[PDB]
Amino acid sequence: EQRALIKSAHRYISEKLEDHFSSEFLPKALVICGEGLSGISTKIADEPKPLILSYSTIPGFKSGELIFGYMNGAPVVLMNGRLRSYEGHSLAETVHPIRALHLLGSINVLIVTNAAGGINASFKAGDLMCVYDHINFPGLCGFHPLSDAYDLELRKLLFSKKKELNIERKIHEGTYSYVHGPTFESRAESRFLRLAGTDAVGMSTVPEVVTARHCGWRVLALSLITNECVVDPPASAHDENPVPIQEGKATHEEVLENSAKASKDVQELIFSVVAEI
Amino acid sequence: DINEQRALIKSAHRYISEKLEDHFSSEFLPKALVICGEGLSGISTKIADEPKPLILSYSTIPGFKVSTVPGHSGELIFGYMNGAPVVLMNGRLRSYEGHSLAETVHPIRALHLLGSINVLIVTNAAGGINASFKAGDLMCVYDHINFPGLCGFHPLRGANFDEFGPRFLATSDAYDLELRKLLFSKKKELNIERKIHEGTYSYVHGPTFESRAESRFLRLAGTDAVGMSTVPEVVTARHCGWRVLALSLITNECVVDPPASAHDENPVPIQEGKATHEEVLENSAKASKDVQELIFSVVAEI
Amino acid sequence: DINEQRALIKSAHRYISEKLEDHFSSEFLPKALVICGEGLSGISTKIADEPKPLILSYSTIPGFKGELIFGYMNGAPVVLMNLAETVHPIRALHLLGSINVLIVTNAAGGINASFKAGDLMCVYDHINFPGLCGFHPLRGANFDEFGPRFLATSDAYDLELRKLLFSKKKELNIERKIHEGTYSYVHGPTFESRAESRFLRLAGTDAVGMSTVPEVVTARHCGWRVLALSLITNECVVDPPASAHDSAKASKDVQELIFSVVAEI
Numbered sequence: 128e129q130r131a132l133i134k135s136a137h138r139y140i141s142e143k144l145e146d147h148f149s150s151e152f153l154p155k156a157l158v159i160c161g162e163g164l165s166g167i168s169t170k171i172a173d174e175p176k177p178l179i180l181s182y183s184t185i186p187g188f189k190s191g192e193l194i195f196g197y198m199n200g201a202p203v204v205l206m207n208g209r210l211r212s213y214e215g216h217s218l219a220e221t222v223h224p225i226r227a228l229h230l231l232g233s234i235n236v237l238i239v240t241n242a243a244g245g246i247n248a249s250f251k252a253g254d255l256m257c258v259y260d261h262i263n264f265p266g267l268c269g270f271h272p273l274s275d276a277y278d279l280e281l282r283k284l285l286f287s288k289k290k291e292l293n294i295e296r297k298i299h300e301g302t303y304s305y306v307h308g309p310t311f312e313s314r315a316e317s318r319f320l321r322l323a324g325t326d327a328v329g330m331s332t333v334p335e336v337v338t339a340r341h342c343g344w345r346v347l348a349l350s351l352i353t354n355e356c357v358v359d360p361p362a363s364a365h366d367e368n369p370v371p372i373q374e375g376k377a378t379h380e381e382v383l384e385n386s387a388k389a390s391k392d393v394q395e396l397i398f399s400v401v402a403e404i
Numbered sequence: 405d406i407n408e409q410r411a412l413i414k415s416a417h418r419y420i421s422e423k424l425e426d427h428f429s430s431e432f433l434p435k436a437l438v439i440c441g442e443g444l445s446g447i448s449t450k451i452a453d454e455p456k457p458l459i460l461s462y463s464t465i466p467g468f469k470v471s472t473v474p475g476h477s478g479e480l481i482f483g484y485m486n487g488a489p490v491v492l493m494n495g496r497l498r499s500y501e502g503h504s505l506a507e508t509v510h511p512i513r514a515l516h517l518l519g520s521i522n523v524l525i526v527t528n529a530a531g532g533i534n535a536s537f538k539a540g541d542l543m544c545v546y547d548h549i550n551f552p553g554l555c556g557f558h559p560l561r562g563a564n565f566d567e568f569g570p571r572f573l574a575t576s577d578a579y580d581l582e583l584r585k586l587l588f589s590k591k592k593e594l595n596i597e598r599k600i601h602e603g604t605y606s607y608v609h610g611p612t613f614e615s616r617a618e619s620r621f622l623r624l625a626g627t628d629a630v631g632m633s634t635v636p637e638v639v640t641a642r643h644c645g646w647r648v649l650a651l652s653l654i655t656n657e658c659v660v661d662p663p664a665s666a667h668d669e670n671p672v673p674i675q676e677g678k679a680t681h682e683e684v685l686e687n688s689a690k691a692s693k694d695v696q697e698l699i700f701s702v703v704a705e706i
Numbered sequence: 707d708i709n710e711q712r713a714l715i716k717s718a719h720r721y722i723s724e725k726l727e728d729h730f731s732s733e734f735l736p737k738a739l740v741i742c743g744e745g746l747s748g749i750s751t752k753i754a755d756e757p758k759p760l761i762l763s764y765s766t767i768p769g770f771k772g773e774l775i776f777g778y779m780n781g782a783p784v785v786l787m788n789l790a791e792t793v794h795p796i797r798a799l800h801l802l803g804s805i806n807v808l809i810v811t812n813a814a815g816g817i818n819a820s821f822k823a824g825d826l827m828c829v830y831d832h833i834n835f836p837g838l839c840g841f842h843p844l845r846g847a848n849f850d851e852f853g854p855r856f857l858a859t860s861d862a863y864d865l866e867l868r869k870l871l872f873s874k875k876k877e878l879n880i881e882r883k884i885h886e887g888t889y890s891y892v893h894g895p896t897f898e899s900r901a902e903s904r905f906l907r908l909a910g911t912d913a914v915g916m917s918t919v920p921e922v923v924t925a926r927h928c929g930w931r932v933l934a935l936s937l938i939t940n941e942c943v944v945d946p947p948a949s950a951h952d953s954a955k956a957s958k959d960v961q962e963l964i965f966s967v968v969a970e971i
C-alpha cells in the first residue's frame with residue numbers, strides 16, 4: 128500500500144528530470160542538509176541549470192525542497208528540509224524521500240549532516256564529529272522506518288579532504304545517539320547518555336541512515352557539535368553559593384548560530400568529497 | 405491533530421472560566437496548580453471552607469478523561485489554601501491506564517489559559533533506587549530522567565503549541581532553586597523531622613513494579629527514585645513557562661539484588677521484599693500529614 | 707476494548723475447552739504451556755503417542771492471529787504453542803483452570819562476554835525496555851479477574867523450576883554450557899549496532915532478543931510460575947568499528963531438557 132505512494136513520487140520526479148535536463152540526469156549521491164547546511168545550495172553549478180522541486184508538489188512528501196544539479200562535476204540531489212519524528216511524523220514518512228529517490232537506480236551514497244549536542248566531555252561547540260556508529264533509542268521500542276552502517280572508506284576520504292583543504296576545525300570520530308526530542312537533555316539524561324557510550328546526541332538522522340543502508344547505499348554522516356550538553360548536578364537547595372540552574376542551558380538560537388558558523392567548512396568538505404564518490 | 409487539541413483546550417478553559425466567574429464574587433486567579441499524588445488526596449482538606457470552594461468533576465470538563473481506577477474519577481478543586489488561591493488536581497491520569505501523554509497533560513494547558521498560574525507543585529509516591537533512601541523519607545526532585553521520552557513517548561511530540569512555549573525546550577533548568585529552598589525553609593519552620601532528600605526522579609510507564617535488573621539499570625543510569633507519573637506534567641508545565649516544585653514520597657525500597665541462583669546454599673526467596681500496591685498506599689497515608697503541611701505553608705509564599 | 711477483549715478470551719476458551727472434551731476420552735487439564743522459540747519446534751515430536759494428540763490451527767481459534775498442540779509429554783498433560791493480543795492465548799488457556807507453569811524457550815544473542823555461541827542461558831531476570839517506555843502487555847484497563855493492577859516482577863523467575871532444570875542437565879549428561887542470566891527484551895533488530903550491544907552489556911544484559919518477556923509478564927499476571935531458557939545463537943560484537951585513522955545439536959539438547967523437566971511438575 129505505501130508503495131504506490133513511493134512509485135508516484137518516483138514517477139513525478141523522473142518526469143520532471145526528463146523535462147528539465149537536456150541529458151539524462153542520474154544523481155550519484157543524496158545530501159541531506161541538516162541544521163545550518165542549507166547554503167550548500169550555492170555549491171550547485173549554474174550550468175546545466177538546477178532543478179528545484181518543492182516538497183508540496185511531490186507525492187507523499189508531507190517547507191522544504193529537493194535540488195537536482197551538479198556539484199563539483201558530480202550529479203547530486205540535495206534534501207533541503209528534513210522531517211523529524213518529534214514533529215509527529217511517522218518514521219516511514221520521514222524516510223519516504225529516500226525510498227522514492229532510490230527508484231532512480233543511480234544513487235549509491237547518502238551524505239547526511241546534522242547538529243548535535245556534545246556528550247563526550249572533550250568535545251567543544253564548533254567541533255565536527257564523523258559518525259562511525261549509533262544508538263537508536265526509539266528503535267529500542269520498535270519505532271522503525273522500515274551491519275556496519277558508516278562506510279570506512281568514506282570516513283577516510285572525509286579526513287583526507289580535511290587535510291587537503293587545510294581545514295583546522297576538529298573532526299572527531301564517534302557514536303551518535305538518536306533520541307526522540309523535542310526537549311534538550313536534563314543533566315541526568317546527558318550523564319546517562321555519556322555512560323551509555325554516546326559521543327554526540329541529536330534528534331534525527333538514524334532512521335535515514337538505516338533506510339539508506341536497506342536500499343544498498345553507503346553512508347557518510349557528519350555532526351556539527353553546536354553545544355556542550357549540561358551534565359553537572361543542579362544547584363542544591365543547601366548551597367549557599369549555587370551555580371544558577373539556567374547557566375549553560377541549550378537553546379535553539381545557539382544551535383542555529385553555531386551551525387551557521389561551521390557551515391562553510393562543512394560545505395567545502397562535502398564539495399570535495401562528492402567528486403570522489 | 406493540533407487544531408482539535410486547541411479547540412478542546414479552548415473549550416475546557418471556557419467551561420472552567422465561566423464556572424469560576426459564576427461561583428466566586430471576586431475574580432478567582434489561582435497562583436499554583438497542585439497535583440496530588442497517590443495517597444495524598446488529604447491535601448484537599450487544606451482548602452478553606454470560606455470563600456466556598458468550587459469542585460469540578462473531570463466528567464463534566466470538555467476534553468478531560470476519567471481515570472480507569474474506580475471510584476477515583478478525578479476532580480479539580482478551586483479554593484483558598486492558607487489564603488492563597490489555588491487549584492488542586494485530585495487524581496491524575498496516568499499513561500499506563502491507556503491515556504495518551506497528551507491526554508494526561510491537557511489539564512495543564514487548559515488551566516494555563518486562566519492567565520494566573522505560574523507554579524506547578526506536583527507530588528507523587530516513588531520506589532527508592534538510591535540505596536540510602538528508606539521508606540517514609542521524602543525526596544525533593546531537583547532533576548529527572550525521561551527515558552520514555554528519549555525513546556519516543558513524549559508529551560511534546562507533534563506540532564508545537566507556539567502560543568504556549570518554544571519548539572525546543574531545555575530541561576537542565578526544570579526544578580527551580582528558590583522553590584526548593586522555600587520547601588526546606590518550611591520544613592525548618594514546621595519542625596518536621598522526616599528526611600527530605602534531593603535527587604533525580606525517573607518516569608517509567610508501568611504498571612509493573614521494576615524487576616531487579618530494571619532497578620539496577622535505573623540506578624546505574626542515575627535514578628534516585630522511580631515512579632509512573634510526574635515527568636510529563638513537569639515538562640508541559642515548563643513548556644507553558646511555569647516554575648516547578650516536585651516532591652516524591654519514598655513508599656518502598658526497590659529490589660536491586662540479583663535473585664537467588666540455582667546454586668545458592670541458603671537462598672534468599674525471590675519474593676522477599678516484593679513491592680505491593682497496599683505497601684505503597686499505607687506508606688503514603690503515613691506521610692500525608694507532613695506533605696500536606698509543607699504544601700499549605702509553601703503556597704502562602706509563592 | 708477491555709470488554710471485547712474479555713469476550714474474545716472467553717470465546718477462545720469456550721472453543722478450546724469444547725474441542726478438548728470431544729477429542730480426549732478423559733479430561734485433558736494441562737499443567738504447562740510450552741512456548742517453543744525460534745528453531746525449537748522439535749518438542750512437537752516428543753509429545754506422547756497415546757492418547758493421540760489434539761492439534762488446533764490458530765486460524766480456527768476465535769481471536770487468535772502456528773498451532774496449539776494438546777497431548778501428553780513424558781507423562782504430563784501439556785499444551786504447546788508452535789501485544790495484548792500477543793498474550794490473548796495465555797489468558798484463554800488460563801481459563802482452563804489447570805496450567806500453572808509457562809516454559810518459554812527462545813534464541814538470543816550473547817551480550818555477556820563469557821557467553822559463547824551454542825551455550826544456554828537459563829533466565830532468572832529480565833529487562834523489559836519497551837515496557838519501561840509504553841509498549842507493555844498490561845497497558846490499559848486491568849483484567850481484575852486475572853491479577854493485580856500493579857504486578858511485581860522482582861519475583862518473576864521461580865528458583866525451584868531453575869534448580870529443576872539444572873538437575874535434568876546432569877542426569878542426561880549434557881556437556882553444553884548453561885549460564886544463569888538476564889534477558890533483555892528489545893524491539894530492535896538483529897541489526898543491532900556495536901554501540902547498541904555495548905549499551906545493552908553495560909545496562910546489565912546477558913542475552914538479548916525480541917520475545918519472551920511479554921509472555922512472562924502475562925503469565926505472572928495470571929499467577930503462573932515461569933521457566934525461561936535461551937539458546938545463544940551468536941556472540942554480539944561490542945568493539946567499536948575501525949577508525950579512519952588506523953545447529954540442531956542445541957535444539958535436540960533443549961528438547962530432552964524440557965521433556966525431562968515436564969515430568970516433575
Ligand SMILES: Nc1nc2c(CN3C[C@H](CO)[C@@H](O)C3)c[nH]c2c(=O)[nH]1
Nearest residue numbers: 242243244328329330377379382572
Ligand atoms: N537531543 C539533542 N539534539 C540536539 C541538536 C540537534 N537538533 C537541533 C534542533 C534543536 O535546536 C533539533 O532538531 C535537535 C543540537 N543540539 C542538541 C542537543 O543538545 N540535544
Ligand SMILES: Nc1nc2c(CN3C[C@H](CO)[C@@H](O)C3)c[nH]c2c(=O)[nH]1
Nearest residue numbers: 442529530531630631632681684856
Ligand atoms: N515504577 C514505580 N512506581 C512506583 C510508585 C508510584 N505509583 C504508585 C502506584 C503503585 O502503587 C503506581 O501508580 C506507581 C510507588 N512505588 C513505585 C515503584 O516501586 N515503582
